[PDB]
Scaffold this motif. Structure first.
Motif, PDB file in Angstrom:
ATOM      1  N   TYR A 195      56.249  26.228  27.216  1.00 27.32           N
ATOM      2  CA  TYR A 195      56.866  24.922  27.016  1.00 27.32           C
ATOM      3  C   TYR A 195      57.363  24.695  25.595  1.00 27.32           C
ATOM      4  CZ  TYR A 195      54.277  23.791  31.291  1.00 27.32           C
ATOM      5  OH  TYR A 195      53.777  23.776  32.580  1.00 27.32           O
ATOM      6  N   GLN A 199      58.940  19.772  26.663  1.00 28.26           N
ATOM      7  CA  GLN A 199      58.418  20.149  27.974  1.00 28.26           C
ATOM      8  C   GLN A 199      56.904  19.981  28.034  1.00 28.26           C
ATOM      9  OE1 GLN A 199      60.167  24.059  27.936  1.00 28.26           O
ATOM     10  NE2 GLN A 199      61.822  23.446  29.330  1.00 28.26           N
ATOM     11  N   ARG A 377      69.956   2.178  23.439  1.00 30.53           N
ATOM     12  CA  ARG A 377      69.899   1.172  24.490  1.00 30.53           C
ATOM     13  C   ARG A 377      68.478   0.917  24.995  1.00 30.53           C
ATOM     14  NH1 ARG A 377      75.668   1.859  27.746  1.00 30.53           N
ATOM     15  NH2 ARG A 377      76.785   2.929  26.053  1.00 30.53           N
ATOM     16  N   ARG A 379      65.754   2.467  25.791  1.00 27.58           N
ATOM     17  CA  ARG A 379      64.952   3.293  26.687  1.00 27.58           C
ATOM     18  C   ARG A 379      63.822   4.002  25.946  1.00 27.58           C
ATOM     19  NH1 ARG A 379      70.046   5.751  26.787  1.00 27.58           N
ATOM     20  NH2 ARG A 379      70.238   7.575  25.405  1.00 27.58           N
ATOM     21  N   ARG A 465      69.524  20.762  21.693  1.00 29.53           N
ATOM     22  CA  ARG A 465      69.142  21.581  22.836  1.00 29.53           C
ATOM     23  C   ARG A 465      67.667  21.386  23.195  1.00 29.53           C
ATOM     24  NH1 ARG A 465      70.671  26.413  24.866  1.00 29.53           N
ATOM     25  NH2 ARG A 465      69.246  27.157  26.508  1.00 29.53           N
ATOM     26  N   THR A 537      78.573  12.729  19.740  1.00 32.65           N
ATOM     27  CA  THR A 537      78.917  13.404  20.999  1.00 32.65           C
ATOM     28  C   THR A 537      78.111  14.688  21.167  1.00 32.65           C
ATOM     29  OG1 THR A 537      80.777  14.578  19.945  1.00 32.65           O
ATOM     30  CG2 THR A 537      81.244  12.484  21.009  1.00 32.65           C
ATOM     31  N   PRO A 538      77.928  15.157  22.416  1.00 39.78           N
ATOM     32  CA  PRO A 538      77.147  16.381  22.626  1.00 39.78           C
ATOM     33  C   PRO A 538      77.796  17.573  21.937  1.00 39.78           C
ATOM     34  CG  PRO A 538      77.430  15.201  24.695  1.00 39.78           C
ATOM     35  CD  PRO A 538      78.348  14.542  23.686  1.00 39.78           C
ATOM     36  N   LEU A 539      76.985  18.379  21.259  1.00 38.87           N
ATOM     37  CA  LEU A 539      77.472  19.524  20.504  1.00 38.87           C
ATOM     38  C   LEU A 539      77.603  20.724  21.424  1.00 38.87           C
ATOM     39  CD1 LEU A 539      75.088  19.264  17.396  1.00 38.87           C
ATOM     40  CD2 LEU A 539      77.484  18.573  17.504  1.00 38.87           C
ATOM     41  N   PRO A 540      78.785  21.351  21.430  1.00 43.33           N
ATOM     42  CA  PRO A 540      79.033  22.528  22.269  1.00 43.33           C
ATOM     43  C   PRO A 540      78.056  23.651  21.960  1.00 43.33           C
ATOM     44  CG  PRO A 540      81.088  21.675  21.431  1.00 43.33           C
ATOM     45  CD  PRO A 540      80.007  20.885  20.752  1.00 43.33           C
ATOM     46  N   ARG A 543      74.561  24.241  23.900  1.00 47.12           N
ATOM     47  CA  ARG A 543      74.466  24.999  25.141  1.00 47.12           C
ATOM     48  C   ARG A 543      74.707  26.480  24.902  1.00 47.12           C
ATOM     49  NH1 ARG A 543      75.958  19.960  27.135  1.00 47.12           N
ATOM     50  NH2 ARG A 543      74.750  19.364  28.998  1.00 47.12           N
ATOM     51  N   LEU A 544      75.591  26.781  23.959  1.00 46.51           N
ATOM     52  CA  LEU A 544      75.990  28.153  23.685  1.00 46.51           C
ATOM     53  C   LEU A 544      74.855  28.945  23.039  1.00 46.51           C
ATOM     54  CD1 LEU A 544      79.494  29.199  22.407  1.00 46.51           C
ATOM     55  CD2 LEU A 544      77.437  30.347  21.550  1.00 46.51           C
ATOM     56  N   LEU A 545      73.839  28.240  22.553  1.00 46.97           N
ATOM     57  CA  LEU A 545      72.664  28.902  22.004  1.00 46.97           C
ATOM     58  C   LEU A 545      71.795  29.455  23.122  1.00 46.97           C
ATOM     59  CD1 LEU A 545      71.597  26.413  19.184  1.00 46.97           C
ATOM     60  CD2 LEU A 545      72.735  28.625  18.907  1.00 46.97           C
ATOM     61  N   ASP A 546      71.361  30.699  22.969  1.00 49.29           N
ATOM     62  CA  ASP A 546      70.390  31.273  23.888  1.00 49.29           C
ATOM     63  C   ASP A 546      68.996  30.916  23.378  1.00 49.29           C
ATOM     64  OD1 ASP A 546      69.101  32.680  25.844  1.00 49.29           O
ATOM     65  OD2 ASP A 546      69.555  34.666  25.022  1.00 49.29           O
ATOM     66  N   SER A 548      66.533  29.027  25.780  1.00 51.69           N
ATOM     67  CA  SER A 548      65.625  28.780  26.895  1.00 51.69           C
ATOM     68  C   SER A 548      64.380  29.657  26.823  1.00 51.69           C
ATOM     69  CB  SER A 548      66.343  29.031  28.218  1.00 51.69           C
ATOM     70  OG  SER A 548      66.963  30.308  28.223  1.00 51.69           O
ATOM     71  N   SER A 549      64.552  30.868  26.302  1.00 49.68           N
ATOM     72  CA  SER A 549      63.491  31.868  26.282  1.00 49.68           C
ATOM     73  C   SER A 549      62.607  31.776  25.037  1.00 49.68           C
ATOM     74  CB  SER A 549      64.103  33.268  26.377  1.00 49.68           C
ATOM     75  OG  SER A 549      65.124  33.444  25.405  1.00 49.68           O
TER      76      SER A 549
END
Lengths: 563, 563
Positions: A195, A199, A377, A379, A465, A537-540, A543-546, A548-549
């Motif tokens: 995690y 997470q 807002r 939350r 991310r 705004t969301p930075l491209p 996502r382009l970063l690997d 998750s692992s």
């Protein structure tokens, strides 16, 4: 058996050691009370050695046997492979302790000099010889803390025990794939290193929510590594061997177990015989995975022994959280005592007795707790927090004495949503990077026990991310987070938050003046410092970063690398 | 101006075409009513040509000018680079339409034969010549549907208009980096292709929740590509050029704009002059990005024209969803008419008039809607659903006629949590893969307009990463999802769900008997088919997959590849 025996020879430094925080205008602008900041050194090794040396007795029972039987069944569905030499070499951190055999990390990573031929020779010897103990070096760790007056003053240095670089590379060839696959197979959702901080918060929230009447506790084992018995370590081997493995891996894993993991002779940096170990080695690839699995088995068995109702656990090495159904105030206290007595029979006695908690935010996992703040807002946003004192003290040391593998960058990434990271660490270090003109240079840091390499200019993408765009718009921090940070700043003689806000406005403007990725850091990381806030705004790149692992077990002493 | 002019020459096939679903025991076991399934072919090209040919008038106003001014400001913070030839080559899909100049996709991907020298020559010509129209080929797409008796019967083929492979590679060198960075910069959260199906659901939920009294609509532009004017396409160029770009990219982008994007001559597969285009080319790299940005500008301006209150949009090419504050029944209907009239002035007239909806689940985005089901322990899980008729019809065709780039695999991945994917598509295709003994072979498929390559044995990891472990434990599907699937199965003459359950039990047992990754597919994908269900643990591979980046704009005809 005793966890260690000793010859009387000293645990010696391999380099000059400094105990006191040096004074310096850069570090002084972070915190003034430098005499409160200290570094552990070999001077206190003997004190630690005393603490970690004791007798172990272990009495197992039917609950333990049943849990282990289940673990082995689950492990049988795992298939793992050897790593090639090249793969194992690439996982070696840039400044890993050099070999005694005439090569260092640089040679390992480039597959040059004596490295390849030596490592090949070590591997062959592992395949041929399953018996001869492998020598290790024992060293005092140099780690920085803030004095705690009313709590004993200064902590003794931790001890690290590790085999030669050549052996460490072989460990990866034999077992790295297992580290990636086995913990999740046998522990499922309980395995904590899978995690990210976000997470982990989510898991804990869910575990808490699914109980009609939740009660949780953390269990602190006294000196976990020393409580791990030779039998425990051989049991870890039997779990590894339950997987489907090529014969060559089975052979290497058995040899490493009997020659290294179960125990062996320790030498000081001078080469003198220092002692003999019969417990977990703190600096091997399997330290974290081993501790995690063994803590899990003992803890699950102890829940059964105690009659804990519907346990949901989060295990990170020796760090243990257990959330379950409350059976009432008195029954909970009773059941926790039964849990502790069972853990104790299994060899894992407590440092401090566990306490039942009925508020999720009071539960600590790896020194961290769940906190809440408001995002855009209004939350509610939940995130992982901690006490900022140690991070701030280490940031100061690392400003005046550059660490090849630092901690401030790891703290910015892990605790990005916190008020202290946002207002203090980000402001201080982006200022320092501009002073040094090194904004765009990769830096190595430790996180979850292992080593990573990051370019500070990629922080906005990394933070988004891992923590979401909300990491950049958090407000209305909790009272505890506010008092926590104000207290730590006062204690260390640092400027108060209002001064950091003024500083950040200028750091932000300086970044923005530079354009490019530096301007992105200014806009995103320091949006909090301006009244006329930008809509981000969301930075491209996020996502382009690997990434998750990114989060995995890691290794002892953290000898694993990912750039 | 007219969207197209025509010479009278035919739109001709480049290969034999089949209109009727062939009969075959494998496809027949999925669905029996094969005469209901049809493929579009060149036979109906003329009918489509008529529909897409019409006059465009465009009258802009202050709302449009203001939105565009904002977009250009946002674009100015973007920096993009050229791709190297090698990079652009690797983004070419394995079966991309071969060049007229003596090389195909195989040669592009391997950097062999005439490919490199030819592409270099094309690039140089783009830098030297910004004027000469570049020729394109026009073709009828062969796509499969199910007849809709009470709705006109059969759809005419879609038309695809594309330049030579050599030019397509140059498009990537010039503009791929822009496709990765610009949409998010100018549209932020509104850009739909940045989201996985789960993230799209989350965005829509959040947009709905943040309105005191939500009203949403989708807007269907009639023949979007044909409504795009030469001025619109030149405006897209001005947005691209607002970014920071190297001179060479600026030059290539301008040449591609004037020689290709704004219009040019079309030839049939026989080489005869077929017509001239003055609208969006459907088969260029910029088709999706261009449509997305241009739809966004027109739609935001039209919201301003109409007085729409607090618009939150989701834009996916020409697919538009707008969620806002309801102003009351009658005012909403009035404001929607004003929105349509403004869109119409901007050249994007409606196919069907937009309808205000007050239930989020009724809003369609890209033919999909939000649905809800229960996960483990009764918790509500929201996910993306669609009508299964087209997916099922295409699955049948692709069972008997193998497509180099299929659709069934894309549907399994995108709609993994749906009852039809889980019970019908997964059962059918894992059975077929075992019959063929090709379980462990990578397959190419289309998703979000582009091409991907996946090994079916990696599906459990992919599905977990994209949709969570809950994708494997969903139950208590909605009434609409249940009627939807039962109706589609009856219509197509497929077995009912109870028969699929029986089939799946056997497919599952066969996978499990094979051990390894096949057994993982059996256990995870088919847990729903057994009464004694397994407790599934998180798959290590799910994190180890580099997938965060998967979802991006894509390209016209989807000529972009990621393995």
């Amino acid at each position: 058996s005793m966890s260690y025996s000793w010859t009387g020879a000293l645990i010696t430094p391999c380099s000059p050691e400094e105990e006191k925080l040096p004074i310096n205008p850069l570090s002084n602008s972070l915190l003034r009370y430098h005499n409160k900041v200290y570094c552990t050194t070999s001077k206190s090794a003997s004190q630690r050695a005393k603490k970690v040396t004791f007798d172990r007795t272990q009495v197992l029972d039917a609950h333990y046997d049943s849990v282990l039987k289940d673990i082995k069944l689950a492990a049988s569905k795992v298939s793992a492979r050897l790593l090639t030499l090249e793969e194992a070499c690439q996982l070696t951190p840039p400044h890993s302790a050099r070999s005694k055999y005439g090569f260092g990390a640089k040679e390992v990573r480039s597959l040059s000099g004596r490295a390849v031929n030596h490592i090949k020779s070590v591997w062959k010897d592992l395949l041929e010889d399953p018996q001869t103990p492998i020598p290790t070096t024992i060293m005092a760790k140099n780690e920085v803390f803030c004095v705690d007056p009313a709590k004993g003053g200064k902590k003794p240095a931790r001890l690290i025990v590790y085999p030669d670089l050549g052996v460490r590379v072989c460990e990866k060839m034999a077992l790295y794939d297992i580290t990636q696959k086995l913990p999740q197979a046998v522990m499922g959702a309980s395995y904590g290193f899978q995690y990210s901080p976000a997470q982990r918060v989510e898991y804990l929230l869910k575990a808490w929510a699914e109980k009609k009447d939740p009660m949780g506790f953390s269990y602190d084992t006294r000196c976990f590594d020393s409580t791990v018995t030779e039998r425990d370590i051989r049991t870890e081997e039997s779990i590894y061997q339950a997987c489907s493995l090529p014969e060559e891996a089975r052979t290497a894993i058995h040899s490493l177990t009997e020659r290294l993991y179960v125990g062996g002779p320790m030498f000081n940096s001078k080469g003198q015989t220092c002692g003999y170990r019969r417990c977990r080695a703190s600096g091997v690839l399997t330290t974290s995975m081993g501790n995690t699995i063994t803590c899990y088995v003992k803890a699950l068995a102890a829940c059964k022994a105690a009659g804990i109702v519907a346990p949901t656990m989060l295990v990170c090495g020796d760090d243990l959280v257990v959330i379950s159904e409350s059976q009432g105030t008195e029954e909970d206290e009773r059941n926790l005592r039964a849990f502790t007595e069972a853990m104790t029979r299994y060899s894992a006695p407590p440092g401090d007795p566990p306490r039942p908690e009925y508020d999720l935010e009071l539960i600590t996992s790896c020194s961290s707790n769940v906190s809440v703040a408001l995002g855009p807002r209004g939350r509610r946003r939940y995130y992982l927090a901690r006490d900022p004192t140690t991070p701030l003290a280490r940031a100061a040391w690392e400003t005046v004495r550059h660490s090849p593998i630092n901690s401030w960058l790891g703290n910015i990434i892990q605790y990005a949503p916190t008020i202290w990271v946002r207002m203090v660490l980000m402001t201080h270090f982006f200022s320092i990077l501009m002073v040094q003109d090194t904004l765009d240079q990769n830096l190595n840091f430790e996180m979850y026990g292992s080593v990573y390499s990051v370019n500070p200019l990629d922080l906005p993408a990394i933070i988004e991310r891992l923590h979401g765009l909300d990491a950049f718009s958090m407000h209305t921090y909790s009272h505890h987070e506010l008092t926590r940070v104000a207290s730590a700043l006062r204690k260390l003689g640092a400027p108060p938050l209002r001064v950091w806000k003024s500083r950040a406005r200028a750091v932000r403007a300086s970044l923005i003046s530079r354009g490019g990725k530096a301007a992105v850091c200014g806009r995103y990381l320091f949006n909090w410092a301006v009244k006329t806030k930008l809509k981000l705004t969301p930075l491209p790149e996020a996502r382009l970063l690997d990434l998750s692992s990114w989060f995995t077990v890691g290794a002892g002493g953290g000898d694993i690398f990912h750039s």
